[PDB]
Amino acid sequence: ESLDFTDYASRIIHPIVRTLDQSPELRSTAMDTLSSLVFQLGKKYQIFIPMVNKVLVRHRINHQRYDVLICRIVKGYTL
Amino acid sequence: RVFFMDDVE
Amino acid sequence: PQLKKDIQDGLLKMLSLVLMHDVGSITLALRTLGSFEFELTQFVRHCADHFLNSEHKEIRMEAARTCSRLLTPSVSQTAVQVVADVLSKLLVVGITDPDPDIRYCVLASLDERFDAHLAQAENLQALFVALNDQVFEIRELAICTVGRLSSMNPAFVMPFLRKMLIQILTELEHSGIGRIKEQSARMLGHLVSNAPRLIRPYMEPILKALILKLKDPNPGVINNVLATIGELAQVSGLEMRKWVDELFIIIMDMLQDSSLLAKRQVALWTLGQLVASTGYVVEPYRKYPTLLEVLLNFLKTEQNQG
Amino acid sequence: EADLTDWNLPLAFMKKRHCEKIEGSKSLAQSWRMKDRMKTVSVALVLCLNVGVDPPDVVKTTPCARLECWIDPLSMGPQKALETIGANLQKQYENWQPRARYKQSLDPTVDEVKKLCTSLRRNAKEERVLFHYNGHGVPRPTVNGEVWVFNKNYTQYIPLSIYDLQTWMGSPSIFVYDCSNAGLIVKSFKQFALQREQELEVSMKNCIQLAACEATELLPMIPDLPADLFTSCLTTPIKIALRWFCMQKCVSLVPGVTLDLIEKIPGRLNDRRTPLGELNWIFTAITDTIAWNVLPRDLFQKLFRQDLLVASLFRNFLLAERIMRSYNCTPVSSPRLPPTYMHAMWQAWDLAVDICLSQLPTIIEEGTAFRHSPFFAEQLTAFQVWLTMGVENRNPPEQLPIVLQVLLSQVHRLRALDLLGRFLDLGPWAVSLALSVGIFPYVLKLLQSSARELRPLLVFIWAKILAVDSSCQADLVKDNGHKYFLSVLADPYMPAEHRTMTAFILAVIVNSYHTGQEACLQGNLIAICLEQLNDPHPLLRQWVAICLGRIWQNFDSARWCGVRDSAHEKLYSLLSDPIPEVRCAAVFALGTFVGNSAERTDHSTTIDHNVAMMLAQLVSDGSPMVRKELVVALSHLVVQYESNFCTVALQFISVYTQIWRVLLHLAADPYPEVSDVAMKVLNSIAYKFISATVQTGFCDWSARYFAQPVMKIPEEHDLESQIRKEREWRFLRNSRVRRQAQQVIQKGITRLDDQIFLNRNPGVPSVVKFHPFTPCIAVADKDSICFWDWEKGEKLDYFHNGNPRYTRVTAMEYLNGQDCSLLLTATDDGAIRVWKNFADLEKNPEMVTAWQGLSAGMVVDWEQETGLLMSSGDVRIVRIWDTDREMKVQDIPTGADSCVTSLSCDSHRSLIVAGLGDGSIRVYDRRMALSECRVMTYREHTAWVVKASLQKRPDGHIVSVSVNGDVRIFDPRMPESVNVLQIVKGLTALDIHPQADLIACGSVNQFTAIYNSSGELINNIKYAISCLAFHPHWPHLAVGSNDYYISVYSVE
């Protein structure tokens, strides 16, 4: 919320997907943190959308805020 | 204007 | 080469027949397609879908190698756009694919041949994201490529390289962890080698920080810092004549006796690069009378040819 | 090989006018225009500093913060400090907005503030007013929404409700707050505005607010920084940024830099060549860049472009946000700006500052020469790199405001103009972005500069601007830059391309805009264009003619000037110009000149008649678009003389009679669009309103050329393109077909009796032609044109020629047979038309061009290499239409009473052979003069010549066969026949093959005799066989009897 993470996008994203794959217990918390990181990054997150969507489909991950954020990003509409 | 433009003759 | 055209026509016909339509056969086909030269657009666009929709790690790796080798012929606006989107897919693969081996391999495959298209803003942003990768080797390669691109797009590279220099210097100065300082010093050496124009104004602070680290009470960190000062000696170009005396004192202090963890090979190399860069000759002999004795003793003691 | 022959073949009727439909490109909604320009007439500076007294709410530390507006209050006494700080703040604000009424309130009362706000509002009721508040010396604002001020004796802090404050103020105003809890002030202001909106049922967006900190946050108390931190950021961004830089750990990267050195920095904020000016310019460019990149376009235009003071305040507010973030303080603005502390451009700002100030020790002590920072050069280099491969509509480059900022100076102005023009060449979207970013006023100001090197870049940029947006003509006329463009056009040394672009700029300036029309009439434009009318450049001539026509569009003054300059007479030459585009431009000019007579003297009547007579001889024009412009010009003539034309029309139920006959010719035009327009124009005459006037889209279609990119390499040159690869593949197939046919011919000719297929057509097959390479055979019926296949055996398409019942399709041809082929359909009356997309799955019949010819049936003999087209028939003349120029080049007299039944020509030579109904077969050479064109005239037949074909070999043999069915083989170098044969007493049709000497003859008794030139018997196939054709390469023969049956034969 308060810092800039445009630099460490991979440094945080890759552990997140690995944690999602390796532990169903932390799926909710990891998805919330990832959604916050997406909201902070904005358009810079378009790189990781394919891989992350693949993981979500692989694990049926349906998060409302993450889904709406990705939809807004792909639409290009900003809020 | 909004910006000062110099050296225009 | 009686009929090389006929030979290549027959081979291309057979390759098209094979690729129009198990796992090991596809691996062999990809290796063959990437091995030697050929005469390839629809295949590239189709394999672009192929390595996306292939869960096999070996298949993805072979496809990545094949794409990189086949992209050697790199004016058509349509073809430039095709190569641009192919490169974009290649970069998103090299940033997002979990497999560190495949990420490093594709990033390495991004050679000097792709520099023109790599200098673009989006590709530079992807490289900026990639520079903060888990794999330290991938990090080093990313910083090397970015430093090499400091001349093509200075406006977008120089500020980011300055910020990464800031982070590397503070990491080296503050982090009291051997591995972290090893990676920081190695990063500094790569930045020196690849961005001399960026680091040249900051020669005084970088050298001062390296000196302060060198005076502190792990062999990887000390070897890396010695390599870094050697490269900085080349980069500065007579701009570090003030600090030659202290550099000589510390390098000879660690040069004498083998108890030091730092390697005499890198120590002698950086001493030679320092001498060549700053033109310090004869005067070191007069100031330090044991220098000749030490250097001649090394010929009787050391066994490594290097 | 045979590839070079295919490569060096002109593609007739394959150009922009033919492929692209003629019409104007629709103008997009240009919202770049500024809706309104507001001005900060007055500024109010309320300074509740309370010097010498600390507010009870905060217990400041012993050092605390003592710098307020860079003045230490305790040094010069309380009241003197208060007045001095007020004056200094007024000066700081005057640095950005000098022209404003500044009134300072120093520890004021409620009544004093009320009187000031009322007075300022009365002074500026409908304009923005700045209200600055500095509550450092008063307690923090209450949650109720009150601001503390002083009473008369300065013993108690009397609150002031924000509702009352905004009540005193109007709707248009901006407020700046510098206090610990300005967030509370902002929240209360918004809540009270919502309360006002609720009350209004039974001033939110207009008001602008800037705040120092969030409600919970407190102002920093670090001794190093000034207490008046937010105001210092908003007023002295460079000073505060340099000081903030000199405190960060980044200073360790440049030793020997200290606040004292920062204080003794040289240069002013105005002289950009100085260090301080350079830093200010870089800072402005970087903050503008961040604003444009982050904020949306609408908010960016509303904030950073509306007025100078608001734009500067927000540009400094971005720096305020970045600086205050490091001290746990979040500045607040009424329009919530997305955070900009993390934007990458701030790293460039730090790098530029570090580079610029690193020379300060030598500047101050040693006194070196200030070397200019490479920031702008590097950014322009990045913009160039983006342009190198930015063809796609990807993310816009981040350096557009940087280009705008560098345009102001002169050091990099030329390069900036070059790159900006290159960017505009990308397309209308790029030009729209350049307009939205705010380049229009500056590119307009560039016209005042007299530097001659700027002229080409300026005209290129402005041409793109006008091509996208045509409303710029008003601003161009107001700025009087049309004199700049006139001087550009009046320079012979200037390249023709830039002169053409200047002519286009003037044309769009004078497009249906009276003020520009009379301005250019005053501007000697008519004489200038006439001087630059005969330039060896088709594009220049076309646009000059278009501009000349547009100038006298409903302008009698321009018409009189053209009359004095004999502009009509000088433009008479362009009607014979080879280029149809230039001809169309000339016709448009003549028509517009005619259209605005406005009942002048008998001289005007005579000159109008002269122009009408000159335009009357362009009826026999190949280009239907030119003929459409002819219709438009004659419509101008009609509207000028409606009564006379009505009288002429009523006479039939000598000038207008000839014009009406011309209009009848245009009405009976093969082109459907031209015929429809002409018929509507003529129908308007009979029922005699203004709605009948129709304007063609030719002018806007030509204008679209500058909208399209020009600098980039054309697609055809591209070596790796799909289109080029497709053409190469077709050429490869053509070469293979030619080689295989050559092999078959060398192997000899065997008896041909195989029947590939037998189908029935709705109509009698009149004439059959085979496509040279693709397996498509064109069979023309009385009212339809069938396109069959001899491989798949299916019906592909069914066309309708559209010719009347009496007429008939006599001959056909396949233009550009090598690739991208067309179909030529020449009716017996004279109507010649071209068909495209005749045998394609995803495309329908398309008519490329059509034009009435001349005026047995009609005989055609296409010559692909030279591109010439000749039509012959009942007329005693053989015309030679040139497809490249669309004009008739030569009209050789036949010198025979009988109709020309057949015609043929030899490639690489002029050996036009024309059979005749009487029996004689004449030969004409066009190389010599017309009266000497006829070379030989031998007569050995008395019957209609069925087919006087000629062999493509150098030893051309004229195998002439008449209705008598007797074969005579003449030669172009001999006066007598070489071989004589008699085959069939009554012959109906015949066909020959150049490659294989097979003379295919018909018979009334269903016999199909296929003999040789020497007359040896080969085949007599047993079934009015009026159609036989041979494949140009394969030994294939198609035979069509009186019955509507079609067959294709092959030699095994």
Residue numbers in the entry:
A (entry chain B): 1144 to 1222
B (entry chain H): 399 to 407
C (entry chain A): 529 to 549, 578 to 595, 599 to 633, 644 to 786, 791 to 879
D (entry chain F): 18 to 219, 236 to 686, 806 to 840, 950 to 1116, 1125 to 1292, 1303 to 1331
Share the article's original sentences.
To assess whether the LST2 TOS motif is functional, we examined whether a synthetic peptide corresponding to the LST2 TOS sequence binds RAPTOR. To further improve the resolution of the visualization of TOS motif interactions, we analyzed mTORC1 in complex with the synthetic LST2 TOS peptide, for which higher concentrations could be reached compared to full-length LST2. The LST2 TOS peptide contains three negatively charged residues which make electrostatic interactions with the positively charged TOS-binding pocket. F401 and M403 anchor the TOS peptide by binding in particularly deep cavities in the TOS-binding site, via hydrophobic interactions with surrounding residues. Finally, a comparison of LST2 TOS and previously described 4E-BP1 TOS binding shows that the TOS peptides, in particular, the consensus phenylalanine (F401 in LST2 and F114 in 4E-BP1), share a common mode of binding to the RAPTOR pocket. We performed fluorescence anisotropy with purified RAPTOR protein and a FITC-labeled LST2 TOS peptide including flanking residues (amino acids 395 to 407). The TOS peptide bound RAPTOR with a dissociation constant (Kd) of 330 nM. Thus, RAPTOR binds the LST2 TOS sequence with sub-micromolar affinity and LST2 F401 is critical for binding.
pmcMechanistic target of rapamycin (mTOR, also known as mammalian TOR) is an essential serine/threonine protein kinase that responds to nutrients, growth factors, and cellular energy to promote cell growth. mTOR nucleates two distinct complexes, mTORC1 and mTORC2, each characterized by specific subunits, targets, downstream signaling pathways, and functions. mTORC1 contains mTOR, regulatory-associated protein of mTOR (RAPTOR), and mammalian lethal with SEC13 protein 8 (mLST8). RAPTOR binds mTORC1 substrates, including the well-characterized substrates ribosomal protein S6 kinase 1 (S6K1) and 4E binding protein 1 (4E-BP1), through a five-amino acid motif termed TOS. RAPTOR binds the LST2 TOS sequence to present LST2 to the kinase catalytic site in mTOR for phosphorylation of LST2 S670. mTORC1-dependent phosphorylation at S670 leads to monoubiquitination and stabilization of LST2.
